[PDB]
Amino acid sequence: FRPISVFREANEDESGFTCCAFSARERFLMLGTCTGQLKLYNVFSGQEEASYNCHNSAITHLEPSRDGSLLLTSATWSQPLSALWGMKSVFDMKHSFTEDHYVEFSKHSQDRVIGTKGDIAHIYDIQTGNKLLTLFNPDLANNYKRNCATFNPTDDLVLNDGVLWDVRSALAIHKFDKFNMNISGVFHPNGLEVIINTEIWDLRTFHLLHTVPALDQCRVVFNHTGTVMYGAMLQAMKSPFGSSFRTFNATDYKPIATIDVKRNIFDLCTDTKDCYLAVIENQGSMDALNMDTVCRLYEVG
Ligand SMILES: Fc1ccccc1C1=Cc2ccccc2C2=NCCN12
Ligand SMILES: Fc1ccccc1C1=Cc2ccccc2C2=NCCN12
């Protein structure tokens, strides 16, 4: 993990980066801030290129669309809580998702959003904004405190609150048992496995394949090719993770590295070419008057 670049929010005695994601434009990182701003930075020079006020509370999440035309955001205590922005010529609000605390794009064909409200997953048409599906069954719920609904890599299955759902039928096909209070899980990119906290489940048999105790309370991100997996552990403003990230071989779940940066982590994300990891670190402690985050850029391959 060769450090390539570091930078703080321009013209701020208190740097307030809270999340990041590479833009579809090579060389440029998108960051959310604690004042609800979207910033475009050159990742190598640290130069601020653009700024827009998306929300009047802190950004918690953002996801750019792979064609470079759309952007999802989620805030903290804003109504609306999440939104979809156009970035073709003018930066403008397309649609808002009043109470959804988290949103993603579909993966294969990026023609939907999926948004999460507590235990309840909402699927929307991007062109109309219209709500096509509510996926929720009160008898199968796990009530995960950090539930994040997500599409599989072909868009035909949804994981919501530890329940696998067929989309076309709008039926629940399997409830994974609850083994932690917080993490609800993600699809591997290979379409065959589900990662729910420390449990890796087969999608063909619903058997446990692997136990990975190091993944406990981690948010997980894959490289583009899906051969490497990075995890940063939640804490037991306030930094959402601790000071260390783990990296795993994505095909057998054997550890490659444990990095302590010695500074609490807000986010981490991968470029499209499996070259870089970008990490938001806080230089302050939680007790500090204010935040002081940087972005670091690491060569990996
Ligand atoms: F915890 C989460 C679970 C699922 C999705 C997003 C988050 C999250 C919460 C958060 C809270 C305060 C400041 C920054 C963040 C943040 N930045 C990127 C990830 N993230
Ligand atoms: F096996 C099952 C028994 C009962 C209900 C469903 C399944 C199942 C779900 C699935 C989901 C995503 C990818 C592959 C699969 C799969 N492969 C074999 C069977 N199977």
Curated annotation (Swiss-Prot):
Residues 12-211 are annotated as: WD repeat-like region. A motif (DWD box 2) lies at residues 199-206. Induction: Up-regulated in a number of cancer cell lines (at protein level). It comes from Homo sapiens (Human). A motif (DWD box 1) lies at residues 163-170. Changing R204A: Loss of interaction with DDB1, no effect on interaction with TET3. The protein kinase-like region mediates the threonine-protein kinase activity. The DWD boxes are required for interaction with DDB1. Component of the DCX (DDB1-CUL4-X-box) E3 ubiquitin-protein ligase complex, named CUL4A-RBX1-DDB1-DCAF1/VPRBP complex. Interacts with DDB1; the interaction is direct. Also forms a ternary complex with DDA1 and DDB1. Interacts with NF2 (via FERM domain). Component of the EDVP complex, a E3 ligase complex containing DYRK2, EDD/UBR5, DDB1 and DCAF1. Interacts with DYRK2; the interaction is direct. Interacts with RAG1; the interaction is direct. Interacts with LLGL1 and LLGL2. Interacts with histone H3. Ubiquitously expressed. Coiled coil: none annotated. This is DDB1- and CUL4-associated factor 1. The modification Phosphoserine is found at S239. It is found in: Cytoplasm; Nucleus; Cytoplasm, Cytoskeleton, Microtubule organizing center, Centrosome. Belongs to the VPRBP/DCAF1 family.
